[PDB]
Ligand binder design. Structure first.
Ligand SMILES: [Cu+2]
Length: 648
């Protein structure tokens, strides 16, 4: 029976696995963050119509470790207008995996909050054959998506093409105002795979993508988000009796971004930027991974190394005051400001004691350097390099109850994250006493305890996952004051965090089903005896479902508490806290019909009751567009969408 997705269970301890090709009930804006909105734990900062910044249990930014096909794609805007999830079209992947908390060491450094894994799976052709999947979505406000996934091959290897094109106009809020929010996005990507015998795979991949998006939050819109990307991966299997797998992969991703104030808006003569202005930035990322999995019937061991160089450059437009001329950014040389390296080694080990007891541990050690290539701002850290060695690891114990189909789990984790591009270069001020941020921001050290349970019964599925943690040298942003616009200062503080997520799924009759989910996050700034900023409020979802093995309808109610813990004028590189937030409820409806084996119809109405509201985390709306300099960007009002999936 064909459904429409509205939440995801925790399928295993701390681990959520979904297929991002299923329709989702608050229809996602064709980016990475909106596909995480359905998973309890995740909030999204809103910037406009798309390209939100994702947040997991209140943690922001590089604390989330988002990988696409094992590789890592970093954007270039100093103010994270193109966060790593903005280059992702989840409709083109096949699997989405979320691992909550510092509880894997297999996928790179600094995963304090969690790991997110969008991946393509290799084809499985036997005889000579072909396969086409395609989808079309029309919705309110000029929403149109077009998605294609096609492949061909036999048992010796395959060609696969995936690609999408998606766009929408400005949406409107619960009060009929239109919000600066149009966007456009395309992606094209090729993969060639060689399977010379059943144990061997060599796959080669490349693609490009591009997009634009109007940003209600910011003083500039994204007129270009160019992506060029390349990858190679080698996998052998059954190398020996113990050696079960050897994986090597190299990835190259390149981001090339243009933000300006004149292509998607007109400059605004009251603001700090009253003339046409364009900012061009790029980000070149090269990395790879080598890994061996060993298996001997009571133990599994995975050992590997991984590396990563990333480079960052900028160049602006000019504008002559006495001529009204305007020279563009591409008429000038790129100016490097930062290069980052990381090398790491890792080991993860599982013990299958009995069949109701499981022990997992992992360790990883990291060498992480950054060089500051800025010559001026003169620059007291010009051409300075700095590094650190960061041990990280975790232990998880899982035990199944002999009685019921219940699983309990507890785990302890410790993660050290080196500061990222935004934490060292983007803040105009560093800590009191510092020459700048690059010199003094210390790495972040998180120590967290994760616990929860699973119940998979006949009519009743349920899961919970809680966390408690301290964070030493949490990298906090303080906007505090303005002097020519708002300027930030990065600092290090100690903090306490705690929260959890739970959910439940009950089968009423054979056709009727209802589910629920709750998500909480709490955070204290222990160094200053106040709350942590940018924490989302407690939130709850209720769904009702009718399936008749041919077609289904669904109802959804999202209920969100107010947030009364705020730390005004503090936050991250993207947003600051200003006001306690109002709660709200939003109701939604969906159906689905299987027309034939190949053609599946879906449709929904989002926010049926046209609620006027704003999430706590959304950006502070511009004021060049009519906002009171602090009101946050409003969520869309009533919206309809319809989608056809065909798989011939
Ligand atoms: Cu920008």
């Amino acid at each position: 029976a064909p459904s429409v997705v509205t939440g995801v269970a925790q399928s295993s301890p701390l681990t959520i696995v979904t297929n991002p090709k299923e329709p989702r009930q608050p229809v996602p804006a064709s980016d990475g963050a909106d596909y995480l909105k359905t998973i309890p734990g995740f909030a999204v900062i809103r910037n406009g119509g798309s390209n939100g910044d994702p947040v997991l249990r209140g943690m922001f930014g590089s604390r989330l470790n988002i990988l696409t096909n094992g590789g890592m794609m970093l954007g270039a805007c100093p103010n994270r207008m193109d966060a790593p999830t903005s280059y992702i079209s989840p409709e083109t992947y096949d699997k989405l995996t979320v691992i909550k908390g510092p509880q894997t060491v297999l996928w790179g450094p600094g995963a304090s909050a969690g790991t997110i894994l969008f991946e393509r799976e290799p084809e499985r052709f036997g005889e000579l054959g072909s396969r086409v999947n395609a989808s079309l979505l029309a919705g309110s406000n000029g929403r149109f998506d077009k998605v294609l996934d096609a492949a061909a091959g036999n048992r010796l290897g395959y060609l696969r093409f995936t690609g999408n094109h998606a766009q929408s106009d400005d949406y409107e809020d619960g009060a009929g105002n239109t919000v600066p929010s149009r966007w456009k996005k395309w992606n094209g990507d090729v993969a060639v795979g060689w399977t010379p015998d059943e144990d061997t795979l060599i796959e080669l991949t490349a693609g490009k993508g591009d997009g634009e998006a109007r940003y209600a939050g910011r003083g500039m819109d994204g007129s270009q988000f160019k992506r060029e990307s390349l990858g190679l991966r080698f996998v052998k299997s059954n190398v020996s009796d113990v050696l079960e797998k050897v994986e090597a992969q190299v990835y190259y991703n390149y981001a090339d971004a243009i933000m300006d104030n004149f292509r998607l808006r007109t400059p605004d003569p009251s603001s700090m930027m009253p003339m046409p202005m364009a900012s061009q930035v790029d980000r070149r990322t090269l990395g790879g991974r080598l890994a061996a999995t060993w298996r001997w019937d009571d133990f599994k061991l995975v050992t590997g190394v991984d590396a990563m160089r990333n480079e960052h450059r900028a160049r602006g437009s000019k504008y002559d005051m006495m001529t009204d001329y305007y020279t563009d950014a591409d008429q000038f040389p790129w100016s490097k400001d930062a290069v980052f390296h990381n090398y790491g080694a890792f080991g993860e080990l599982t013990w299958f004691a009995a069949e109701r007891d499981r022990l997992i541990g992992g360790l990883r050690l990291d060498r992480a350097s950054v060089k500051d290539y800025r010559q001026t701002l003169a620059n007291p850290t010009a051409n300075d390099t700095r590094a650190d060695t960061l041990p990280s690891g975790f232990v998880r114990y899982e035990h199944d109850l002999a009685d019921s189909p219940t699983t309990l789990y507890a785990g302890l984790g410790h993660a050290e994250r080196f500061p990222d591009y935004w934490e060292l270069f983007s803040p105009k001020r560093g800590p009191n006493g510092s020459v700048n941020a690059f010199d003094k921001i210390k790495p972040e050290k998180t120590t967290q305890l994760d616990f929860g349970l699973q119940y998979n019964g006949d009519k009743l599925q349920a899961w919970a996952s809680g966390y408690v943690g301290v964070v030493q040298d949490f990298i906090l942003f303080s906007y505090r004051e303005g002097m020519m616009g708002s300027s930030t200062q990065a600092t290090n503080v100690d903090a306490r965090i705690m929260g959890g997520e739970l959910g439940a799924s009950y089968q009423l009759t054979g056709n009727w089903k209802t589910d629920a989910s709750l998500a909480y996050a709490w955070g204290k700034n222990s160094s200053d005896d106040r709350a942590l900023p940018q924490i989302p409020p407690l939130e709850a979802r209720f769904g009702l479902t009718y399936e008749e093995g041919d077609w289904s309808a669904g109802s959804l109610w999202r209920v969100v508490a107010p947030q009364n813990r705020i730390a005004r004028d503090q936050g991250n590189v993207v947003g600051k806290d200003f006001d306690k937030s109002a709660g709200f409820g939003v109701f939604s409806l969906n159906g689905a019909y299987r027309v034939t084996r190949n053609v599946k119809l879906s449709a929904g109405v989002d926010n049926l009751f046209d609620k006027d509201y704003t999430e706590h985390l959304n950006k502070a709306g511009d004021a060049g567009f009519g906002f009171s300099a602090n009101e946050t960007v409003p969520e869309p009002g009533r919206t309809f969408w319809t989608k056809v999936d065909f798989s011939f």
